[PDB]
Design a protein around this ligand. Structure first.
Ligand SMILES: CCCCCC/C=C\CCCCCCCCCC(=O)O[C@H](COC(=O)CCCCCCCCCCCCCCC)COP(=O)(O)OC[C@@H](O)CO
Ligand SMILES: CCCCCC/C=C\CCCCCCCCCC(=O)O[C@H](COC(=O)CCCCCCCCCCCCCCC)COP(=O)(O)OC[C@@H](O)CO
Ligand SMILES: CCCCCCCCCCCCCCCCCC(=O)O[C@@H](COC(=O)CCCCCCCCCCCCCCC)COP(=O)(O)OCCN
Ligand SMILES: CCCCCCCCCCCCCCCCCC(=O)O[C@@H](COC(=O)CCCCCCCCCCCCCCC)COP(=O)(O)OCCN
Ligand SMILES: CCCCCCCCCCCCCCCCCC(=O)O[C@@H](COC(=O)CCCCCCCCCCCCCCC)COP(=O)(O)OCCN
Ligand SMILES: CCCCCCCCCCCCCCCCCC(=O)O[C@@H](COC(=O)CCCCCCCCCCCCCCC)COP(=O)(O)OCCN
Ligand SMILES: CC(C)CCC[C@@H](C)[C@H]1CC[C@H]2[C@@H]3CC=C4C[C@@H](OC(=O)CCC(=O)O)CC[C@]4(C)[C@H]3CC[C@]12C
Ligand SMILES: CC(C)CCC[C@@H](C)[C@H]1CC[C@H]2[C@@H]3CC=C4C[C@@H](OC(=O)CCC(=O)O)CC[C@]4(C)[C@H]3CC[C@]12C
Ligand SMILES: CC(C)CCC[C@@H](C)[C@H]1CC[C@H]2[C@@H]3CC=C4C[C@@H](OC(=O)CCC(=O)O)CC[C@]4(C)[C@H]3CC[C@]12C
Ligand SMILES: CC(=O)N[C@@H]1[C@@H](O)[C@H](O)[C@@H](CO)O[C@H]1O
Ligand SMILES: *[C@@H]1O[C@H](CO)[C@@H](O)[C@H](O)[C@H]1NC(C)=O
Lengths: 243, 288, 234, 153, 291
C-alpha cells in the first residue's frame, strides 16, 4: 500500500517532454512496476493460478500490472507523449486500487457507487426536466443582448449552451444575474415587431417564471432525494463494531 | 464558592470578559479612546475575582488556572501598552487569543453530566471514528482530483495581451477587457483576435501572488483548487478559464465529475454520519 | 381581529415609494397605524379585564401579543416611528398562523421540543462569537486588512464564511495581507473553520429537523401494536 | 464645407464646420452658446480637442472588447462609435442645430448609446454598482423627456 | 435480464418511446437561426411524431375510451398531459407559422411544445414511480413554502417601510449630493477580478466618460413590496447576498446590517433545512421504515 501511495505521489509534477524532470520520474515509475510485478508473481505462485484468479481484486491487480508492463516496453522504444500519458493513466488506475486494501475506504466506496446506481432514474428525470427547460430557454432567450453575466460562455443560443448554463444554475452560481440579464427591456435593446429572432432582448415575466421555477424545483426538492439515498446506503453498508 | 450566587456571578463575569476581549482593538480606541480605560478596568476587576478562586481551590481546574494566567498576561500587556512604550499596532495582542474561550465556563453547568458518562463517551467515540473514516475518504478523492488537475490542466498564466506589450511594462492597460485567458496552441483553446497575442504573463515577471493562488501548477495548489471548486464557490469561472486555455472535453469531464462526486455525495456522507449519531442518541438515552 | 390584522399588515406594506417631492412624518399611514395600535390596546385591555392579569399571562400566546402591544404602542411615538420598533408592527402577521390548525400542528411537529433547536442555536451563536473574537485578536493589527479591523467586521467575515459566499475571497485577501511566511497557517485555519462549519453544524441542523419529524420510539411501538365509486359514479 | 483650421482666418458662418464635431457649425454656436471672436474660436477649438481626446479614450476602451461582433444581433460597433461621438459632441455644445435635413431630440442619443453600445461592467472597488451599466441615462423615477440635434445616424 | 427488460412495456409503448427520443434529438438541433419552421430537414421528426401519436391515440381510445369506462386512456394526470402534448404538437404542425412576434401566442405555443420529453415519465414505469414518490409529500412541502412566504412577507414589509427609495446613490462616488450629480464623469471599467496588478504611479486605470445618474442598483431594490420579495427570494439562494448586505450598510447606515443577517439565519439556515428534512422524512415513510 505504501509503495502504491509513493508511486501515486510521483505524479505530483506534470509529465512533459519539454520538462527535463519528466525523464527521471518516468524512470522512477519503471522500477515500481517491476516491484509490483513481484507482488503479482508472489500472489500467483503461492496459490494456484485459478486461486489467484478467484479474487476479483487480484484480477484487477493483474490487469493493471500487465498494462504497466506494456507501458514499460513501449516507453523504451517510442519515447513520445503517448507513452507519458499512458504511464500517468496506469499510475492513476493503480492508485485507485488502494480502496480495496483498506476496510472503511472500501465500505464508503461501495456506498457511493451503490448510491449512484440506485439514483439512475431520479437523475434521468432531472435530465429530462433540464432538457425541457433548455428548449424553452433557447426559444425565449436565444438572442439576448450580452450583459453582466450572459457572455461567450453563459448563453442560450443553442441547446448545448442552454443545458450547460442550466446545470450551472443547478450548482446555483450567480443564477440571479443571468435571470436579470434575461430581463433586459428597452431602452437597453432594439425591439422587433415581426419576429423574435431578429431582436436582442428577452421576456421579463418569462424570465421570472423560468428561473424561479427551475431553481426551486431542482435545487430545493430533487437533490434531497439523492441525500436520502446516500443516508440509506450509508446505513446499509457502513457498520463498525456492534454491541 | 459556597453560594450559588457566586457561580452566577462567575458566569456573568465570563460573559463580561468575553465582551471585553471583543472590545479590545486598536481602531476601537482610535474611535472611542475612553473605552481604553473601560477595557483595562474590567480586565483588572474580573481578574481579582478569579484570583480569589485560584486561592480558594487549594482546600479540570487546570483550565481555570490557564484562564487566570491569560488574564494576568493580558492585564500586564494592557499596562505596558497604556504606558505607550509598546506600539498598539504591535503583534503582542496575540497574547489575548485564548481568553475568549472563557465563554465555555458560562455553559459549564449544562456540560456537567451526572448520568453514566460512559455512554456519552462511547457515542462520541463512535462519531469520531466515523468522521475520521469519511475524512480519509474525502482526502483520498481530493488527492486524486488534484493529481488529475496537475496532469491535465497545466498552468493558467497565458493571457491575451496587447500586440506591443513588453516585459515589465505589464499593467492594466495591457490587458483585454474583460481579461481573457488563451492558449498558444493554434487549434485548442481561445484564439486571440487581431491586435492581441497570447503569451504567458508569468514570463513577463508577475509574481504568483499577483497572478493569484488558484491553479494546477503543483499537487498542493491543485488540491487547494479542487477543495475550492468542491465548495461550489467559483467552479464555473475556473471551468471557463480551463475551456479557454485547454481542450474543452477535459474541462467538461473533470468539473462535471468533480461536482457530481465530491460536492453532492461525499458531503451527504457527513449528513448521514450525523443522522446516525442522532439515531444512537435515540437508542441509548431515549430522553434527549 | 384576524381580518383587522390582515388589513393592517396589507396597508403597512402598501407604503411604497412614490417620490422624493412629498413625504412627511405625519401621513395617512401613520394615522392608520395609530388606529390599529389603539384597537389592539383596546383588545388587550378587554381580554385582561375578562381573564384577569394572571389568567391572561397564563398562556404563551397572550404574553406574545402583550409584547407586541407594548412594542407597537412605543412604535407610534413620533420619534420612534419606522425605527427598529417596526419589527413589532410586522410580527402581528404571526397571529394569522392561528387561522389553520393544520399549519399549527405542523409547526409544533417540525420545531419539536424547543430544547433541541434552542440549544443548537445557542451553540451556533456562541461558536460564532468565540471564533470571531479569536480571528479579531489574530488579525486586527495586520495593516492593509479591514475585514478584521473591529469585532463587527470580524463577525460579518466569519458569518460570510459560514454561508460559503465569497469565503474564498476573504481567504485570498487575508493571505494577501499576511506575509507569505504566514499565509499557509492562516489558510489552514480558514480551511479547518470552513470544513467544521459546513460539514458538521449544517448537518446538525438537518439531523435535528429530521429527528423532529421522526416519531418517538415509544409512539412507534404503540402504533405497531395498535395497527395489528369512481368517475363512473355519475 | 470648410473645416475650421486657423483661428484668425475664420474671423457666411453657416459654411465653416468644426474639425472633430463636424456635425455642428459656427453659426449655431454663435446663436445659442475682432479679438472677441478670436477668443470664441479658440474656446471652440479647445473644446473640440478635449472631445477628441475623450473620444480616443472611448475608442481605446472599446477596441479591447473582444466580444465586439457578438454582443448583439441588431447592433454593430460602428453605430456605437457614431452615437457616442454624437453624444459627446452634443454634451460639449448644448445648442439647437438649424441647417440639417432630418432631426431628433439631442437627449435621445443618450438612450441610443445604451441601446447600441455594449454592456461594459464598471469596476466595483470603492462602490457596489450591483450590475448597473457604466453608461446609463435615466435615474430613479426621473422623467427623461428640449433642444434638437441632427439625425446623424 | 435481457428478456425481462424487453418485456418491460408493450411493443407500441417501445415504438412510441423510440419516436419520442428521435423527435427530441431532432429538436436538439433547433436554434434561433436554424428554425424547424424554415428547415425542412427537421420537419421529418415532427411529422413522424405527430403521425405515430395520432395512431396511438386512435387505437387506444376505441379500446378503452376517454370517459365512463372501467379503464380509460385519460383517467389521471398522465393522460391529460399526453393529450395536451399531442394537441399542442398537432396545432403547431397544422399552423407552422412563418413569423413569431416576441411575447405572442406563437411563442407560447412553441414553448409549450418543449414539454414533449415529459412523455418518458409516463411511458417508463420507473419514472412514474419516482414521480409518485416525490409528490407523496406535497402537503408538507406546501406547508414549508407557506412558512417561508410568511417570513418573506414580514421582512419585505419591514424593508419597504424603512428602505423605500433610500438605496439610490449617485453613480459617481466623488459626488455626495443629489443636486450635484449632473453632466459627465470618468468611470473605470473592470478589467480582471482575480488579477491583482498594481497601477504605476503615473498611470490611470482604463475607463471612459459616462453621464452622472442617481440610479438604484439593477439587481435589487426595495421600492415596492414585489421588488423586496424578489430580493429576499434571491437572498434565500445565498448568491449575491453579500452585495445586498454591503449596499444596505453603506447606503442606509450600518445598524440595518442586523436586518439582513437575521434573515439569513432564519430563512437559509433553518428554513431551507425544512425542505431537506421533509423530503427525507417522506422518503423514509414511503420506503416503509418510518414506524
Ligand atoms: C415540467 C416542467 C417543465 C416546464 C418547462 C418550461 C417552463 C417555462 C415557464 C415559462 C413560461 C413563460 C412563457 C411566456 C411566453 C409569453 O410571452 O406569453 C405571454 C405570457 C402571453 O402573451 P399574450 O397575452 O398572449 O400576448 C398578447 C398579444 O400580444 C398576443 O396574444
Ligand atoms: C451577535 C451580535 C454580534 C454583534 C453585533 C453588533 C451590532 C451593532 C453594530 C453597530 C455597528 C457600529 C459600527 C459601524 C461601522 O462603521 O461598521 C460597519 C459594519 O458594522 C456593521 O454594521 C455590522 C452589522 C452587525 C452584524 C451582526 C448582526 C447580528 C445578527 C447576527 C445574529 C445571527 C445569529 C446566529 C446564531 C444564532 C462598517 O462596515 P463596512 O466596513 O462597510 O463592511
Ligand atoms: C417563493 C416563490 C417565488 C416568489 C416570487 C415573488 C416575487 C415575484 C413577483 C414580482 C412582481 C413584480 C414584477 C412584475 O412586474 O411581475 C410580472 C410577472 O409577474 C409574475 O407573475 C411572475 C411571478 C413568478 C412566480 C412563480 C414562481 C413559482 C416558483 C414555485 C414553483 C408582471 O408582468 P407585467 O406586469 O409586465 O405584464 C405581463 C404582460 N405579458
Ligand atoms: C446505471 C445502471 C442502470 C440500471 C438499470 C436497471 O436497474 O434495470 C432496470 C430495467 O432496465 C431499465 O429500466 C431501462 C429502461 C430504459 C429507461 C431509461 C430510458 C432513458 C431515456 C433518456 C432520454 C434521452 C433522450 C430495472 O430497474 P428497477 O427499477 O427494477 O430496480 C429496482 C431496485 N430494486
Ligand atoms: C405536475 C405533476 C403532477 C403530478 C401528479 C401526482 C403524481 C402522480 O400520481 O402521477 C401519476 C401518473 O404519473 C405521470 O403520468 C407523471 C406525469 C407528470 C409529468 C411531469 C412531472 C414533473 C416532474 C416532477 C415535478 C416536480 C415539481 C415540484 C402516477 O400514478 P401511478 O404510479 O399509479 O401510475 C399509474 C396510474 N394508475
Ligand atoms: C398579504 C399579501 C399582499 C400584501 C399587499 C400587496 C400590496 C401590493 C399592491 C400595492 C403596491 O405596492 O403598489 C405597487 C405594486 O407593487 C406590486 O408589485 C404588487 C406585488 C404584490 C405581490 C405599485 O407599484 P409601482 O406603480 O410603483 O410600479 C412598480 C415598478 N415596477
Ligand atoms: C455575548 C453576546 C450576548 C453579545 C456580545 C456582543 C458584544 C461583544 C458587542 C455588542 C455591541 C458591540 C459594539 C457595538 C458598537 C461598536 C462601535 C464600533 O465603532 C465604530 O467602529 C464606528 C466608528 C465611527 O463611525 O465613528 C466599534 C465596535 C463596537 C464597540 C462593538 C464591539 C462589540 C460589542 C460590544
Ligand atoms: C483540509 C484538507 C482536506 C486538505 C487541504 C490542503 C491543505 C491542508 C494545505 C496542503 C497544501 C497547502 C498549500 C501548499 C502550497 C501553497 C503554496 C504557497 O505558495 C507559495 O508556495 C509561494 C511562496 C512565495 O511566493 O514566497 C501558498 C500556500 C499554499 C497554497 C498551501 C495552502 C494550504 C494547503 C492547500
Ligand atoms: C384536454 C386538456 C389537456 C386541454 C388542453 C387544451 C390545449 C390544446 C389548449 C390549451 C392552451 C391553448 C392555446 C392557448 C393560446 C393560444 C394562443 C393563440 O395565439 C394566437 O395566435 C391568436 C392571437 C394572434 O394570432 O394574434 C393560438 C392558439 C393557442 C396556441 C391555444 C391552442 C390550444 C391550447 C394549447
Ligand atoms: C491587425 C493589427 O493591428 N495588426 C498589428 C499591426 O497593426 C502592427 O503594426 C504590428 C506590429 O508591427 O502588429 C500586428
Ligand atoms: C478609478 O481609479 C482611480 C485610481 O486609479 C480612482 O482614483 C478613481 O476614483 C476610480 N474611479 C471611480 C469612478 O471610482
Amino acid at each position: 500500500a505504501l509503495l502504491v501511495l509513493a508511486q501515486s505521489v510521483l505524479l505530483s509534477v506534470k509529465w512533459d517532454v519539454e520538462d527535463p524532470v519528466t525523464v527521471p520520474l518516468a524512470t522512477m515509475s519503471v522500477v515500481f512496476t517491476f516491484i509490483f510485478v513481484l507482488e503479482v508473481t508472489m500472489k500467483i505462485i503461492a496459490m494456484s493460478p485459478a486461486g489467484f484468479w478467484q479474487s476479483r481484486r487480484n484480477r484487477y491487480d493483474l490487469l493493471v500490472t500487465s498494462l504497466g508492463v506494456v507501458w514499460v516496453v513501449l516507453h523504451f522504444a517510442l519515447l513520445n507523449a503517448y507513452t507519458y500519458m499512458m504511464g500517468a493513466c496506469v499510475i492513476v488506475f493503480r492508485f485507485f486500487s488502494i480502496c480495496g486494501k483498506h476496510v472503511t475506504l472500501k465500505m464508503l466506496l461501495l456506498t457511493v457507487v451503490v448510491s449512484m446506481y440506485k439514483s439512475f432514474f431520479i437523475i434521468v428525470g432531472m435530465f429530462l426536466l433540464l432538457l425541457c427547460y433548455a428548449f424553452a430557454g433557447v426559444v425565449l432567450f436565444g438572442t439576448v443582448k450580452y450583459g453582466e453575466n450572459i457572455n461567450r460562455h453563459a448563453n442560450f443560443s443553442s441547446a448545448g449552451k442552454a443545458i450547460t448554463v442550466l446545470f450551472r444554475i443547478v450548482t446555483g452560481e450567480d443564477w440571479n444575474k443571468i435571470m436579470h440579464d434575461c430581463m433586459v427591456q428597452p431602452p437597453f435593446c432594439t425591439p422587433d415587431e415581426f419576429t423574435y429572432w431578429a431582436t436582442d432582448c428577452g421576456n421579463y415575466a418569462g424570465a421570472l417564471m423560468y428561473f424561479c421555477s427551475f431553481y426551486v424545483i431542482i435545487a430545493y426538492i430533487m437533490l434531497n432525494l439523492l441525500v436520502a439515498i446516500i443516508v440509506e446506503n450509508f446505513s446499509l453498508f457502513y457498520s463498525t463494531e456492534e454491541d | 464558592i459556597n453560594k450559588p450566587w457566586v457561580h452566577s456571578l462567575l458566569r456573568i463575569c465570563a460573559i463580561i470578559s468575553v465582551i471585553s476581549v471583543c472590545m479590545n482593538t486598536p481602531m476601537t480606541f482610535e474611535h472611542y479612546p475612553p473605552l481604553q480605560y473601560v477595557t483595562f478596568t474590567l480586565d483588572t476587576l474580573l481578574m481579582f475575582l478569579y484570583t480569589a478562586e485560584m486561592i480558594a481551590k487549594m482546600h479540570w481546574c487546570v483550565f481555570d488556572g490557564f484562564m487566570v494566567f491569560c488574564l494576568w498576561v493580558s492585564l500586564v500587556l494592557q499596562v505596558f501598552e497604556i504606558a505607550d512604550i509598546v506600539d498598539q499596532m504591535s503583534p503582542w495582542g496575540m497574547l489575548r487569543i485564548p481568553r475568549p474561550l472563557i465563554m465555555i465556563r458560562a455553559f459549564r453547568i449544562y456540560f456537567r453530566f451526572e448520568l453514566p458518562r460512559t455512554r456519552i463517551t462511547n457515542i462520541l467515540k463512535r462519531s469520531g471514528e466515523q468522521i475520521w473514516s469519511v475524512s480519509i475518504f474525502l482526502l483520498f478523492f481530493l488527492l486524486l482530483y488534484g493529481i488529475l488537475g496537475v496532469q491535465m490542466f497545466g498552468t493558467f498564466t497565458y493571457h491575451c495581451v496587447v500586440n506591443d506589450t513588453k516585459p515589465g511594462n505589464v499593467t492594466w492597460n495591457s490587458l483585454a477587457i474583460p481579461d481573457t485567458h488563451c492558449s498558444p496552441e493554434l487549434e485548442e483553446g481561445y484564439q486571440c483576435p487581431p491586435g492581441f497575442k497570447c503569451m504567458d504573463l508569468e514570463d513577463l515577471g508577475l509574481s504568483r501572488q499577483e497572478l493569484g493562488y488558484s491553479g494546477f501548477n503543483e499537487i498542493g495548489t491543485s488540491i487547494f483548487t479542487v477543495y475550492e471548486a468542491a465548495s461550489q464557490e467559483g467552479w464555473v469561472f475556473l471551468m471557463y478559464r480551463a475551456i479557454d486555455s485547454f481542450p474543452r472535453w477535459r474541462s467538461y469531464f473533470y468539473f462535471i465529475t468533480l461536482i457530481f462526486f465530491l460536492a453532492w455525495l461525499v458531503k451527504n456522507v457527513f449528513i448521514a454520519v450525523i443522522i446516525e449519531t442522532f439515531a444512537e442518541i435515540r437508542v441509548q438515552f431515549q430522553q434527549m | 381581529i384576524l381580518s383587522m390584522v390582515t388589513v393592517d399588515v396589507i396597508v403597512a406594506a402598501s407604503n411604497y415609494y412614490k417620490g422624493e417631492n412629498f413625504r412627511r412624518q405625519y401621513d395617512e399611514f401613520y394615522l392608520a397605524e395609530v388606529a390599529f395600535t389603539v384597537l389592539f390596546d383596546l383588545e388587550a385591555l378587554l381580554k385582561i379585564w375578562c381573564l384577569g392579569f394572571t389568567g391572561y399571562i397564563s398562556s404563551s400566546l397572550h404574553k406574545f401579543e402583550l409584547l407586541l402591544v407594548i412594542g407597537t404602542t412605543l412604535h407610534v411615538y413620533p420619534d420612534l416611528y419606522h425605527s427598529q420598533f417596526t419589527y413589532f408592527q410586522v410580527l402581528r402577521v404571526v397571529r394569522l398562523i392561528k387561522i389553520s390548525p393544520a399549519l399549527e400542528d405542523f409547526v409544533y411537529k417540525i420545531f419539536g421540543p424547543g430544547k433541541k433547536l434552542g440549544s443548537l442555536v445557542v451553540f451556533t451563536a456562541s461558536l460564532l462569537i468565540v471564533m470571531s473574537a479569536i480571528s479579531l485578536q489574530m488579525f486586527c493589527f495586520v495593516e492593509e486588512l479591514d475585514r478584521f479591523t473591529t469585532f463587527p467586521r470580524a463577525f460579518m467575515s466569519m458569518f460570510q464564511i459560514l454561508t460559503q459566499e465569497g469565503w474564498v475571497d476573504v481567504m485570498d485577501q487575508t493571505l494577501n495581507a499576511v506575509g507569505h511566511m504566514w499565509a499557509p497557517v492562516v489558510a489552514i485555519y480558514f480551511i479547518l473553520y470552513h470544513l467544521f462549519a459546513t460539514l458538521i453544524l449544517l448537518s446538525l441542523f438537518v439531523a435535528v429537523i429530521l429527528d423532529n419529524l421522526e416519531l418517538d420510539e415509544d409512539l412507534k411501538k404503540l402504533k405497531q401494536l395498535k395497527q395489528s365509486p369512481l368517475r363512473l359514479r355519475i | 464645407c470648410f473645416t475650421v483650421e486657423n483661428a484668425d482666418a475664420v474671423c457666411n458662418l453657416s459654411d465653416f464646420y468644426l474639425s472633430f464635431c463636424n456635425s455642428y457649425t459656427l453659426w449655431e454656436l454663435f446663436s445659442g452658446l475682432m479679438t472677441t471672436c478670436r477668443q470664441c474660436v479658440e474656446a471652440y477649438q479647445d473644446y473640440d480637442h478635449h472631445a477628441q481626446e475623450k473620444y480616443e479614450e472611448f475608442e481605446s476602451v472599446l477596441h479591447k472588447y473582444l466580444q465586439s461582433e457578438e454582443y448583439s444581433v441588431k447592433s454593430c460597433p460602428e453605430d456605437c462609435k457614431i452615437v457616442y461621438k454624437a453624444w459627446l459632441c452634443s454634451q460639449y455644445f448644448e445648442v439647437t442645430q438649424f441647417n440639417c435635413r432630418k432631426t431628433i431630440p439631442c437627449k435621445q442619443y443618450c438612450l441610443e448609446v445604451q441601446t447600441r453600445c455594449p454592456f461594459i461592467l464598471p469596476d466595483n472597488d470603492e462602490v457596489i454598482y450591483g450590475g448597473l451599466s457604466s453608461f446609463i441615462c435615466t435615474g430613479l423615477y426621473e422623467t427623461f423627456l428640449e433642444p434638437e440635434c441632427c439625425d446623424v445616424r | 435480464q435481457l428478456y425481462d427488460l424487453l418485456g418491460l412495456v408493450t411493443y407500441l409503448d417501445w415504438v412510441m418511446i423510440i419516436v419520442t427520443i428521435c423527435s427530441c434529438i431532432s429538436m436538439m438541433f433547433e436554434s434561433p437561426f436554424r428554425r424547424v419552421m424554415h428547415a425542412p430537414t427537421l420537419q421529418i421528426a415532427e411529422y413522424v411524431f405527430v403521425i405515430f401519436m395520432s395512431i396511438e391515440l386512435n387505437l387506444k381510445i376505441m379500446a378503452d375510451g376517454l370517459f365512463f369506462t372501467p379503464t380509460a386512456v385519460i383517467r389521471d394526470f398522465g393522460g391529460v398531459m399526453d393529450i395536451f402534448i399531442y394537441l399542442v404538437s398537432l396545432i403547431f404542425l397544422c399552423w407552422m407559422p412563418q413569423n413569431v412576434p416576441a411575447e405572442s401566442g406563437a411563442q407560447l405555443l412553441m414553448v409549450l411544445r418543449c414539454l414533449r420529453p415529459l412523455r418518458i415519465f409516463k411511458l417508463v414505469p420507473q419514472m412514474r414511480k419516482v414521480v409518485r414518490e416525490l409528490f407523496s409529500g406535497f402537503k408538507e412541502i406546501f406547508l414549508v413554502s407557506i412558512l417561508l412566504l410568511t417570513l418573506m412577507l414580514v421582512f419585505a414589509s419591514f424593508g419597504v417601510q424603512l428602505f423605500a427609495g433610500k438605496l439610490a446613490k449617485c453613480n459617481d462616488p466623488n459626488i455626495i449630493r443629489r443636486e450635484d450629480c449632473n453632466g459627465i464623469f470618468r468611470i473605470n471599467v473592470s478589467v480582471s477580478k482575480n488579477l491583482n496588478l498594481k497601477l504605476r504611479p503615473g498611470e490611470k486605470k482604463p475607463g471612459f466618460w459616462v453621464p452622472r445618474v442617481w440610479a438604484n442598483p439593477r439587481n435589487f431594490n426595495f421600492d415596492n413590496v414585489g421588488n423586496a420579495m424578489l430580493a429576499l427570494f434571491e437572498v434565500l439562494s445565498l448568491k449575491g447576498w453579500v452585495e445586498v448586505r454591503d449596499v444596505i450598510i453603506h447606503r442606509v447606515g450600518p445598524i440595518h446590517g442586523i436586518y439582513i443577517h437575521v434573515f439569513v439565519f432564519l430563512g437559509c439556515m433553518i428554513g431551507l433545512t425544512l425542505f431537506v428534512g421533509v423530503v427525507i422524512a417522506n422518503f423514509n415513510e414511503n420506503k416503509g421504515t418510518a414506524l
